[PDB]
Amino acid sequence: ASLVIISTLDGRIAALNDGKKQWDLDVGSGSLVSSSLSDVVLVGGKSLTTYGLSAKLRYICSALGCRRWDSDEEEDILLLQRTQKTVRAVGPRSGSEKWNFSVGHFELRYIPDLDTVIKVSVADWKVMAFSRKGGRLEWEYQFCTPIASAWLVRDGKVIPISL
Amino acid sequence: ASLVIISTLDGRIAALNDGKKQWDLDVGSGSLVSSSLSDVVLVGGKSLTTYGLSAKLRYICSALGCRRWDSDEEEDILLLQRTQKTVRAVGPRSGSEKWNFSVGHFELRYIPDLDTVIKVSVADWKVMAFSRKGGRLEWEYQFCTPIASAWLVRDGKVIPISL
């Protein structure tokens, strides 16, 4: 087929003449950004994990190891990794946390086994699909959450659909 | 009092005319270094945690929060943080891990509420205590594991006893 991948602010990945959704899968990492307020010591940690998707969770490889799932079909493959920076501030007196924040993002790689164009209206979080003229609209997908990152995955590679 | 703190390769912290041991406490992080062998994707993550010690675990603050313990006595305080870098290599085909390795270290800060000198023979992992002349030996502590980092904590600060 030929689909579009979308990384949103809530930390969500979605995939789409239509733009219908085929699947939307997330990870236990929450939003791609967070903040708070409640001499200091500061704790933290970045983490680059990796999620093996089909076109489905077959494995999750991280800095500790892998968690796998059953079933088969060979088949297709879609690499997906999550980079989550994180750091809290904490009073040396006692772990009372003055404040905290964290940022994150996804990146995409593909592993293997009639055109129009796509632009993303970040103002209204639209995924717009046009045509040729210039260009005439064909469809658009609206997300109920700010779009962080997006790519175009047709053939078997990954063009990053820019802001 | 007046004591000497020692960070060893196994990821262990120890404290010592004597050099007797008053306490030796560790964390669930294993050795300060590790390695292995079994186009690649690479997972990883650094983590800077913090351990609140007395002179005892009262709290462990990390990038996720705190775990505390009971009892009281005010009292004394000894800040101790662990920085653990870690990264595995993993085949894009499937999380089979081509290899992996990790490094780590501790650093010390003090929070409050007749001399001789100390050198560390890294060759035989000795903690040597001398005197004045020159200098004559008074005692030595031998560790059954390579010494990574060491400090001198007398008054209420931290001089790093060098290699």
Author numbering:
A (entry chain A), B (entry chain A): 103 to 118, 122 to 143, 191 to 207, 211 to 228, 232 to 271, 306 to 355
What do the paper's sentences say?
There are three sensor/transducer proteins: Ire1, PERK, and Atf6, that are critical for initiating mammalian UPR cell signaling and give rise to three separate branches of the response. All three proteins have a luminal sensor/transducer domain that in concert with BiP is vital for sensing ER stress, an ER transmembrane region, and a cytosolic domain that propagates the UPR signal (Bertolotti et al, 2000; Schröder & Kaufman, 2005; Ron & Walter, 2007; Zhang & Kaufman, 2008).
Concurrently, we also expressed and purified mouse PERK luminal domain encompassing residues 101–399 based on the human PERK-optimized construct. The crystal structure of mouse PERK luminal domain exhibits a dimer arrangement (Fig3A and B). The tetramer subdomain is disordered and is not visible within the structure. Furthermore, since the dimer interface is present in both dimer and tetramer structures, this suggests that this is a biologically relevant and stable dimer interface. We found that mouse PERK luminal domain also forms a dimer–tetramer species that exists in a similar ratio (dim3:2tet) to that of human PERK luminal domain protein (Fig5B). In the yeast Ire1 structure, the α2 helix is disordered, similar to mouse PERK structure.
